[PDB]
Amino acid sequence: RPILGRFSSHLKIGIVGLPNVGKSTFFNIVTKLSIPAENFPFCTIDPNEARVYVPDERFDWLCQLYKPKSEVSAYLEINDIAGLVRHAGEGLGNAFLSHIRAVDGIFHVLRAFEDSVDPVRDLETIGEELRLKDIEFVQNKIDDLEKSMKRSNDKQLKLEHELCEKVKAHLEDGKDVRFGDWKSADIEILNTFQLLTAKPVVYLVNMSEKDYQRKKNKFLPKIHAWVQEHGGETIIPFSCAFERLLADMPPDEAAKYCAENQIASVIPKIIKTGFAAIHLIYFFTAGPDEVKCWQIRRQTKAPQAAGTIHTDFERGFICAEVMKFDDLKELGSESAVKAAGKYRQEGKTYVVQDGDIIFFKFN
Numbered sequence: 001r002p003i004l005g006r007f008s009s010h011l012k013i014g015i016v017g018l019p020n021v022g023k024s025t026f027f028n029i030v031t032k033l034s035i036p037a038e039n040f041p042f043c044t045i046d047p048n049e050a051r052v053y054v055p056d057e058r059f060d061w062l063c064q065l066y067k068p069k070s071e072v073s074a075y076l077e078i079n080d081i082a083g084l085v086r087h088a089g090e091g092l093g094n095a096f097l098s099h100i101r102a103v104d105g106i107f108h109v110l111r112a113f114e115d116s117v118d119p120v121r122d123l124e125t126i127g128e129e130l131r132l133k134d135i136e137f138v139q140n141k142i143d144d145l146e147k148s149m150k151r152s153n154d155k156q157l158k159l160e161h162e163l164c165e166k167v168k169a170h171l172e173d174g175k176d177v178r179f180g181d182w183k184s185a186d187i188e189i190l191n192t193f194q195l196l197t198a199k200p201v202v203y204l205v206n207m208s209e210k211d212y213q214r215k216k217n218k219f220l221p222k223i224h225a226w227v228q229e230h231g232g233e234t235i236i237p238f239s240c241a242f243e244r245l246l247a248d249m250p251p252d253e254a255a256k257y258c259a260e261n262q263i264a265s266v267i268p269k270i271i272k273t274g275f276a277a278i279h280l281i282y283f284f285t286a287g288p289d290e291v292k293c294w295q296i297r298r299q300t301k302a303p304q305a306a307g308t309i310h311t312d313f314e315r316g317f318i319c320a321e322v323m324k325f326d327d328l329k330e331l332g333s334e335s336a337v338k339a340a341g342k343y344r345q346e347g348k349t350y351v352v353q354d355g356d357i358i359f360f361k362f363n
Helices: 023-033 057-066 094-100 117-150 155-172 183-194 209-213 220-228 238-247 251-261 267-279 304-309 311-313 324-332 334-340
Strands: 013-016 051-052 071-072 074-081 103-111 202-206 233-237 280-286 291-296 315-325 344-346 357-362
Touching: 013 023, 013 315, 023 051, 023 103, 023 238, 057 280, 057 291, 057 324, 071 074, 074 267, 094 117, 103 117, 103 267, 117 155, 117 183, 117 220, 155 183, 202 220, 202 267, 209 233, 209 238, 220 233, 233 238, 233 267, 238 251, 267 280, 291 304, 304 311, 304 315, 304 357, 311 315, 311 357, 315 324, 324 334
Parallel strands: 013 074, 013 103, 071 291, 103 202, 202 233, 280 357
Antiparallel strands: 051 074, 280 291, 315 344, 315 357
């Protein structure tokens, strides 16, 4: 059950691709849709980073029901790594690779259009290159560990070494860390290393507007076949050109273009997917003062979730009062949900589910 990733609340997803895939072009779509930096006064947003609102139909419905004075969405932070660099050739730098450690998952952008063109080759290139860098790390950690074990008897050291060795075999065997089968102990240790191939990926398959509109692309069967045989992560076709074109239109021209050409933007899905793939969810709070998405890592329990709003809610935690969105939609009001006896009252061990509408009781 425990999660491969940073124990942290400021997660982000990195853009990774071989050149001419449209890495900076995808970033430019994202930047165009990003939340202005002055809304994040605690932060400094480098020009290679962007933050986009996560769209959610449940959230919008709650806003229609409560018409609150404040509406606050969750966001996804996205990093274009290419912009920081610009290595000889045949892959990414070591420079590029050092900036990946700093992200929590990867939008792997693939080139699936013609004017050589082999997205499957490019998958293999990057995956080999990530594993090699992981092997380097783990070897160095092996070197340091046995130096220490020579002059110390710390039990920690044998355990890490025992794992590093398991991880080295797995990697040398051609397998990525995140697809290994690790016990809770191992994952605890792995999360201190933050290995590159430990990071989850969402494959973005870049193609012409034509291929994307007709939902048909020559490279995508092989790409798909490769991905099912390498962890089976989500694959999302998109067209940088179309999305760029659609993003520069006024809203009504955009809707016309979608109807006249029977085509739709996949950016909402890309954002939602990426936010989920890095193991984030959110729960809602909803009344007339405010409707809000309160993001948390998956498997967060109620009092930790309470804590993110106000520390008193965790220190004084009594219970979390929880409505499921489907029950509120169905029955039409909090009153009706209470009446029907589905306004649950959940304790310290309750794992917050994505979509939970919560009111915290404390002190």
